[PDB]
């Protein structure tokens, strides 16, 4: 249960000192990463999130208008061009406000939910880097919700449902929720904080979450919620964050016309469910110990001949499974079938299809699982339907 | 036919001086961009391209090992960290060789086709920037093929087929192909160039392409092919490039074990079909004048009520179309139906579904196109099937 060893064994990714803290994703690791994005996109569709893409660097003058910039200016990579200085973005939020500021908005556009899979970079001390857990370049399942004060409770509800629904998909059902105190120095009126804290407290009560208040001081932007999942080793991983912001929309001049035809500043809700997805893949690799569920497995099925007489059949099957949307590989190598099955079992391929002489003549295929279970000779279409159901439902367990 | 005006009208993207040459993609522009990636991914699947992801910056020491670095060092953004200097990648190729250099390879791994949608940045003079056509950050449909000398002809054939097949999808069928001369200063033996030029010439003859030899000097890496499409205004756009490389794999220490058990340097083939995809969207926006084909349209269907009596029906329909994989929006605003239809026609929505009292009671829906064609009342499932066929086939024209 070391994602760096499993990552190497399954050829998921690598790192080198020429680019510290930045992942080289190999084909199979990138497959897992794209599948996670597909999964995230399907869950946001339910809430009608927009999906946007912001630029990788912006003028330092823009970043200086955010606020508590001094505290983070040390962690950003900077660059320059034509006597102008840029920061590689360490966060997507100011870019999202730029998109919100294009076009007059009014109350009828809110809540405006805007998600991005945007790569961000931070200049972390090299001594703290570790595998996929602590990186310099990361992509989170990021989004920002622009809403009114009244809409906070409903919007925080949606985030809560999204956290519990996405975590359970992977088998994470023990979840701890920590609310945050209000620090000495904050932006915003006391009244505005008091109402927002009421929204958060009401939203957690309706869902019956047992929350604690965290001992350390919270942010200056607004109240904050952090979600911690526990893996099968009962290890704690803080992944989800919901952060209210009364500061950034005002600093970057976001506004909308309200019902009273009066110009107002939207509330921003920053939130991420998985957090850094490089890290979440690290957690998953260890949670499953490399036995990825079928929908996540880089290679879902391997089809093998016993002799060269079945090679044309195996290629036919492979094309058929591939056209049915299954990540499938043919293994036509000159190796004994017991050698091939063992090799692909060690590489954690969910299903293994064996094609001898009986199967070419019958139109069927012999099915073995990576756990060693012998499922017998099955019709090709039966196998396809069963595989498609396991994939579309993102089932955690096999047939 | 100005993509910057159409881009603004349809709310596809914007740019600002805080990040010159770098696109802020809005929801609808990003939808087009992701659809293009889906399309590219489906065409590469046919050739079993891998898809990888490399880091955004690498040590300047690595970039200096490439060769003709002096010529391009002026165009890269540089940054630094812990008394070490990095270049924001202006190209994906050295990152792909790093991935190839992880793991011993042999002849049985070749050809190894490795694609990436990787964002790259170049420090272009601000005076040359223009819309989506000349940017500082761009993503091309990039790939690198590692192969043997013998495999060049077959590999170049695949690229040729991919160029003609992808361009025709968008309606581009007039294509001009230019081969390149051999410059005075080149890397590689004369013999190695002579054989590779024979591979390229044979590959073009088999496909019956009329090629010209370009007047200007070619690259020093190897022979080169450029493909130029013509749009409906008969404007020439050079998009595809196939560039042989005998230099980079040797400089960055790529090798494989051959059949004779002898260590050898692979040939690299750099290729892109669409080129910069920001630019290709610009070309498409002008080619279609904003009337995107259904599969590309940011919003494929809009469903409208006439009064509040049909709102529940419209929401039901919307959820049904959405579950069927159609990008669909309900328009329940308090506006006359003729006003709503005109508005969504001006925004180039392919299909418009009108729900009055007759349609709620009949279970049908009235269909109007963005060209003004009245298709009559249709069963909901008929509409879904027709829409799914137009989408899955990426048809250029409506029903
Ligand atoms: C304030 O913005 C706070 N943001 C978050 O905690 C946050 C959580 C989930 C999603 C998004 O988009 C969020 O912004 C804070 O700014 C986060 C932050 C910490 C450190 C640095 N840094 O460069 O050292 C930047 C941002
Ligand atoms: C040599 O590599 C040549 N490459 C290409 O033309 C190319 C075409 C299609 C796909 C890929 O991946 C390619 O590399 C050349 O290096 C391209 C290049 C031009 C200019 C700069 N620059 O930073 O000024 C970098 C690379
Ligand atoms: Zn944020
Ligand atoms: Zn290249």
mmCIF file of C-alpha atoms in Angstrom, chain B residues 15-185:
data_model
loop_
_atom_site.group_PDB
_atom_site.id
_atom_site.type_symbol
_atom_site.label_atom_id
_atom_site.label_comp_id
_atom_site.label_asym_id
_atom_site.label_seq_id
_atom_site.Cartn_x
_atom_site.Cartn_y
_atom_site.Cartn_z
ATOM 1 C CA UNK B 15 -9.318 38.045 -23.900
ATOM 2 C CA UNK B 16 -7.907 40.819 -21.760
ATOM 3 C CA UNK B 17 -4.658 42.772 -21.502
ATOM 4 C CA UNK B 18 -3.953 41.235 -18.090
ATOM 5 C CA UNK B 19 -3.045 38.006 -19.964
ATOM 6 C CA UNK B 20 -2.186 38.833 -23.573
ATOM 7 C CA UNK B 21 -2.421 36.038 -26.114
ATOM 8 C CA UNK B 22 -4.122 33.698 -23.634
ATOM 9 C CA UNK B 23 -7.768 32.708 -24.005
ATOM 10 C CA UNK B 24 -10.466 32.834 -21.301
ATOM 11 C CA UNK B 25 -12.764 30.054 -22.542
ATOM 12 C CA UNK B 26 -16.391 30.513 -21.529
ATOM 13 C CA UNK B 27 -18.769 27.612 -21.084
ATOM 14 C CA UNK B 28 -19.928 27.516 -24.703
ATOM 15 C CA UNK B 29 -16.462 27.953 -26.226
ATOM 16 C CA UNK B 30 -15.085 25.272 -23.887
ATOM 17 C CA UNK B 31 -17.889 22.926 -24.970
ATOM 18 C CA UNK B 32 -16.683 23.224 -28.571
ATOM 19 C CA UNK B 33 -13.092 22.673 -27.434
ATOM 20 C CA UNK B 34 -13.932 19.495 -25.460
ATOM 21 C CA UNK B 35 -16.040 18.134 -28.330
ATOM 22 C CA UNK B 36 -13.010 18.568 -30.607
ATOM 23 C CA UNK B 37 -10.868 16.588 -28.125
ATOM 24 C CA UNK B 38 -13.513 13.844 -28.001
ATOM 25 C CA UNK B 39 -13.425 13.776 -31.817
ATOM 26 C CA UNK B 40 -9.627 13.617 -31.928
ATOM 27 C CA UNK B 41 -9.578 10.861 -29.288
ATOM 28 C CA UNK B 42 -11.992 8.741 -31.320
ATOM 29 C CA UNK B 43 -9.767 8.998 -34.431
ATOM 30 C CA UNK B 44 -6.556 8.115 -32.591
ATOM 31 C CA UNK B 45 -8.248 5.075 -30.983
ATOM 32 C CA UNK B 46 -8.266 3.596 -34.479
ATOM 33 C CA UNK B 47 -4.428 3.747 -34.492
ATOM 34 C CA UNK B 48 -3.947 2.809 -30.815
ATOM 35 C CA UNK B 49 -2.270 6.081 -29.863
ATOM 36 C CA UNK B 50 -1.371 6.340 -26.239
ATOM 37 C CA UNK B 51 -2.449 9.542 -24.511
ATOM 38 C CA UNK B 52 -0.107 11.002 -21.877
ATOM 39 C CA UNK B 53 0.327 14.242 -19.918
ATOM 40 C CA UNK B 54 3.676 15.931 -19.317
ATOM 41 C CA UNK B 55 4.703 18.607 -16.839
ATOM 42 C CA UNK B 56 4.302 22.290 -17.541
ATOM 43 C CA UNK B 57 7.901 23.269 -16.932
ATOM 44 C CA UNK B 58 11.253 21.543 -16.948
ATOM 45 C CA UNK B 59 14.782 22.374 -15.939
ATOM 46 C CA UNK B 60 16.601 24.657 -18.358
ATOM 47 C CA UNK B 61 19.439 22.088 -18.351
ATOM 48 C CA UNK B 62 17.109 19.632 -20.111
ATOM 49 C CA UNK B 63 16.015 22.179 -22.703
ATOM 50 C CA UNK B 64 19.625 23.047 -23.489
ATOM 51 C CA UNK B 65 20.296 19.423 -24.509
ATOM 52 C CA UNK B 66 17.768 19.584 -27.361
ATOM 53 C CA UNK B 67 19.570 21.403 -30.079
ATOM 54 C CA UNK B 68 19.077 24.668 -31.925
ATOM 55 C CA UNK B 69 18.015 25.763 -28.440
ATOM 56 C CA UNK B 70 19.804 29.067 -29.075
ATOM 57 C CA UNK B 71 17.365 29.826 -31.893
ATOM 58 C CA UNK B 72 14.307 29.403 -29.636
ATOM 59 C CA UNK B 73 15.582 30.363 -26.160
ATOM 60 C CA UNK B 74 14.297 33.893 -26.911
ATOM 61 C CA UNK B 75 10.681 32.708 -27.250
ATOM 62 C CA UNK B 76 10.361 30.723 -24.001
ATOM 63 C CA UNK B 77 8.990 32.009 -20.744
ATOM 64 C CA UNK B 78 11.441 31.193 -17.971
ATOM 65 C CA UNK B 79 10.958 30.973 -14.215
ATOM 66 C CA UNK B 80 12.965 29.804 -11.242
ATOM 67 C CA UNK B 81 12.872 28.001 -7.909
ATOM 68 C CA UNK B 82 15.583 27.324 -5.293
ATOM 69 C CA UNK B 83 18.414 28.696 -7.478
ATOM 70 C CA UNK B 84 17.265 26.467 -10.362
ATOM 71 C CA UNK B 85 15.831 27.779 -13.617
ATOM 72 C CA UNK B 86 12.865 26.342 -15.528
ATOM 73 C CA UNK B 87 11.291 26.943 -18.922
ATOM 74 C CA UNK B 88 7.527 26.833 -19.374
ATOM 75 C CA UNK B 89 7.284 24.223 -22.086
ATOM 76 C CA UNK B 90 6.885 25.658 -25.619
ATOM 77 C CA UNK B 91 6.547 22.121 -27.028
ATOM 78 C CA UNK B 92 5.601 18.641 -25.805
ATOM 79 C CA UNK B 93 8.319 16.651 -27.580
ATOM 80 C CA UNK B 94 11.060 16.495 -24.889
ATOM 81 C CA UNK B 95 8.472 15.539 -22.290
ATOM 82 C CA UNK B 96 7.323 12.663 -24.485
ATOM 83 C CA UNK B 97 10.886 11.421 -24.834
ATOM 84 C CA UNK B 98 11.174 11.465 -21.014
ATOM 85 C CA UNK B 99 8.160 9.129 -20.851
ATOM 86 C CA UNK B 100 9.662 6.902 -23.574
ATOM 87 C CA UNK B 101 12.936 6.755 -21.565
ATOM 88 C CA UNK B 102 11.097 5.253 -18.551
ATOM 89 C CA UNK B 103 11.364 1.528 -19.040
ATOM 90 C CA UNK B 104 13.536 -0.472 -21.369
ATOM 91 C CA UNK B 105 11.984 -0.596 -24.809
ATOM 92 C CA UNK B 106 12.626 -3.008 -27.605
ATOM 93 C CA UNK B 107 11.644 -3.355 -31.239
ATOM 94 C CA UNK B 108 8.405 -5.070 -30.210
ATOM 95 C CA UNK B 109 7.150 -1.849 -28.610
ATOM 96 C CA UNK B 110 7.486 0.022 -31.969
ATOM 97 C CA UNK B 111 5.767 1.942 -33.467
ATOM 98 C CA UNK B 112 4.914 3.699 -30.197
ATOM 99 C CA UNK B 113 2.364 6.450 -30.861
ATOM 100 C CA UNK B 114 2.053 8.953 -28.032
ATOM 101 C CA UNK B 115 -0.474 11.807 -28.182
ATOM 102 C CA UNK B 116 -1.081 14.713 -25.829
ATOM 103 C CA UNK B 117 -3.407 17.703 -25.577
ATOM 104 C CA UNK B 118 -0.731 19.714 -23.880
ATOM 105 C CA UNK B 119 -0.828 23.448 -23.357
ATOM 106 C CA UNK B 120 2.380 25.181 -24.491
ATOM 107 C CA UNK B 121 3.485 28.810 -24.203
ATOM 108 C CA UNK B 122 5.650 31.023 -26.399
ATOM 109 C CA UNK B 123 6.680 34.615 -25.748
ATOM 110 C CA UNK B 124 5.332 36.034 -29.026
ATOM 111 C CA UNK B 125 5.695 39.811 -29.594
ATOM 112 C CA UNK B 126 2.447 41.445 -28.485
ATOM 113 C CA UNK B 127 2.091 43.175 -31.854
ATOM 114 C CA UNK B 128 1.576 39.846 -33.668
ATOM 115 C CA UNK B 129 -1.251 38.556 -31.443
ATOM 116 C CA UNK B 130 -4.635 38.273 -33.136
ATOM 117 C CA UNK B 131 -7.780 36.661 -31.767
ATOM 118 C CA UNK B 132 -7.479 32.890 -31.654
ATOM 119 C CA UNK B 133 -5.151 32.769 -34.685
ATOM 120 C CA UNK B 134 -1.918 33.987 -33.011
ATOM 121 C CA UNK B 135 -1.802 33.321 -29.271
ATOM 122 C CA UNK B 136 0.814 32.869 -26.543
ATOM 123 C CA UNK B 137 -0.782 29.795 -24.944
ATOM 124 C CA UNK B 138 -2.081 27.114 -27.294
ATOM 125 C CA UNK B 139 -3.029 23.424 -27.289
ATOM 126 C CA UNK B 140 -2.420 21.355 -30.352
ATOM 127 C CA UNK B 141 -3.556 17.828 -31.170
ATOM 128 C CA UNK B 142 0.030 16.785 -30.672
ATOM 129 C CA UNK B 143 1.652 13.397 -30.993
ATOM 130 C CA UNK B 144 5.033 11.730 -31.391
ATOM 131 C CA UNK B 145 5.605 8.391 -33.086
ATOM 132 C CA UNK B 146 8.730 6.455 -32.125
ATOM 133 C CA UNK B 147 9.485 3.963 -34.888
ATOM 134 C CA UNK B 148 12.218 2.259 -36.872
ATOM 135 C CA UNK B 149 13.569 3.440 -40.210
ATOM 136 C CA UNK B 150 11.597 0.694 -42.019
ATOM 137 C CA UNK B 151 8.331 1.772 -40.395
ATOM 138 C CA UNK B 152 8.421 5.354 -41.725
ATOM 139 C CA UNK B 153 6.341 4.713 -44.830
ATOM 140 C CA UNK B 154 3.506 2.986 -42.971
ATOM 141 C CA UNK B 155 3.527 5.581 -40.188
ATOM 142 C CA UNK B 156 3.435 8.493 -42.640
ATOM 143 C CA UNK B 157 0.537 6.747 -44.399
ATOM 144 C CA UNK B 158 -1.449 6.738 -41.156
ATOM 145 C CA UNK B 159 -0.834 10.458 -40.678
ATOM 146 C CA UNK B 160 -1.907 11.135 -44.258
ATOM 147 C CA UNK B 161 -5.137 9.178 -43.771
ATOM 148 C CA UNK B 162 -5.756 10.975 -40.475
ATOM 149 C CA UNK B 163 -5.326 14.416 -42.097
ATOM 150 C CA UNK B 164 -7.766 13.731 -44.942
ATOM 151 C CA UNK B 165 -10.275 11.936 -42.696
ATOM 152 C CA UNK B 166 -10.385 14.626 -39.989
ATOM 153 C CA UNK B 167 -10.480 17.576 -42.428
ATOM 154 C CA UNK B 168 -13.381 16.110 -44.400
ATOM 155 C CA UNK B 169 -15.421 15.765 -41.194
ATOM 156 C CA UNK B 170 -15.639 19.593 -41.112
ATOM 157 C CA UNK B 171 -16.234 19.948 -44.858
ATOM 158 C CA UNK B 172 -12.641 20.706 -45.896
ATOM 159 C CA UNK B 173 -11.844 18.692 -48.995
ATOM 160 C CA UNK B 174 -9.521 20.936 -51.000
ATOM 161 C CA UNK B 175 -6.081 20.210 -49.516
ATOM 162 C CA UNK B 176 -2.601 21.212 -50.686
ATOM 163 C CA UNK B 177 0.499 19.276 -49.645
ATOM 164 C CA UNK B 178 4.035 20.688 -49.648
ATOM 165 C CA UNK B 179 7.192 18.601 -49.206
ATOM 166 C CA UNK B 180 10.408 20.235 -48.037
ATOM 167 C CA UNK B 181 13.913 20.512 -49.488
ATOM 168 C CA UNK B 182 17.052 19.458 -47.661
ATOM 169 C CA UNK B 183 18.999 22.403 -46.179
ATOM 170 C CA UNK B 184 22.741 22.959 -46.246
ATOM 171 C CA UNK B 185 23.201 22.201 -42.527
#
